[PDB]
Subunit: 170 residues, 2 copies
C-alpha cells in the first residue's frame, strides 16, 4: 500500500475510518462516538449518514479531503481474494495484515447480526474501522471495514455495505 | 473507451444512463420517466433515489449488473480536463465526443438552475444522460451526465453530483 492510501486511514472515535473520496468516509458502526453534534467539525445535519449493521458511511457536504482522488468501494470481494487490512496503531505504527477472504454472510457476533465477510489471517479491538483493501491492476479497491476477530485461531471479519446477491449467503 | 465501458451506457427513459457499479446507475433528471412504479423491473421502494438538480442516482437493492466492477464517480473534473462523452444513438451507433471541460457552476438553463460543468466540444437532445468520462492511469473515471448543449457554437453541459468546494463557482 502506498503512502497516499495509508493517509486515508484516519483516527475516529474508539477506532479508525477511511476516506474513500474527498467527501465520503467509511467506518465500523461500533466505533462511532456517541452523543456528539458533529464529526470532523461538521454538524450532523450537513452529513448524509448511512448505517447498516456494522457498516457506516458519511457523505459530507464540505470537501474534507480535496487532496484525494475518489477510489472504488465494493461490497466485499470474491471468495479467496487476498486483501490487506491497513491497520494504524495509536503510536503511529503501520501494521498491514494479509488476509484471505471467505464468505459474505449475516453472522451473529456479540449478540448482534453483522452483515460482513470473514477471512483468515495469513489484530486488537482498537483496530476496528481499519479498511480491507486489495489491488486491482494499478489501483486499489476498498471492500470492508474491520469489525471483529476471534479470540484465537486467526479469523477476522470486515463489515461490508448492505446488499444481497447470488454470491453471498442469504 | 473499451467495450465494457460502453456496455455501462444504457437506454433509459427519454435518454440514457450509466452503470457506475452493479447497483449504482446515474442519469440526467429530465430524462427519468414520469408516472412509473419501477425502474428496470425494480419497485421504487427498493431503490435509494438521490436527485439534485439535473443529477439523478439510483442505488438498487438487487445487483443489476453483477458483471461490472465498481468505478469512480467524481463531482466534475479540473478546468481544462479533456473528457469523452460516451454517446449511444437509438440505432446503435457510438459517437464518442471529445470535450475540454470548463467551470463548475450553478447555471440557469431553460428556466431552471442546474449544478453542472460546461465544456467545449473539440449532440442531439436524445443524448441526455450520456456519461462524461476521462482516463486516469489505466482506468476510467465518470464525472457527469449530459444535460444541455447550445443551439450552436460548441458548448455542452454535464450535470454533476451536489457538492460545494473551493474550485467551483459558489
Ligand atoms: Cl505493494
Ligand atoms: Cl479534489
Ligand atoms: Cl482509447
Ligand atoms: Cl460483482
Amino acid at each position: 500500500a502506498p503512502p497516499t492510501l495509508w493517509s486515508r486511514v484516519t483516527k475516529f472515535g474508539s477506532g479508525w475510518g477511511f476516506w474513500v473520496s474527498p467527501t465520503v468516509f467509511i467506518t465500523t458502526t461500533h466505533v462511532v462516538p456517541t452523543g456528539v453534534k458533529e464529526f470532523f467539525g461538521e454538524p450532523l445535519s450537513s452529513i448524509a449518514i448511512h448505517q447498516a449493521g456494522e457498516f457506516t458511511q458519511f457523505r459530507f457536504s464540505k470537501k474534507m479531503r480535496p487532496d484525494l482522488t475518489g477510489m472504488v468501494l465494493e461490497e466485499g470481494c470474491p471468495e479467496g481474494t487476498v486483501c490487506s487490512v491497513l491497520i494504524k496503531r495509536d503510536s503511529g505504527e503501520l501494521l498491514p495484515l494479509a488476509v484471505r477472504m471467505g464468505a459474505i454472510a449475516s453472522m451473529r457476533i456479540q449478540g448482534r447480526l453483522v452483515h460482513g465477510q470473514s477471512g483468515m489471517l495469513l489484530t486488537i479491538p482498537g483496530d476496528c474501522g481499519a479498511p480491507y483493501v486489495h489491488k486491482r491492476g494499478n489501483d486499489w479497491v476498498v471492500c470492508g471495514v474491520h469489525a471483529a476477530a476471534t479470540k484465537s485461531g486467526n479469523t477476522v471479519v470486515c463489515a461490508v455495505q448492505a446488499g444481497e446477491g447470488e454470491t453471498a449467503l442469504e
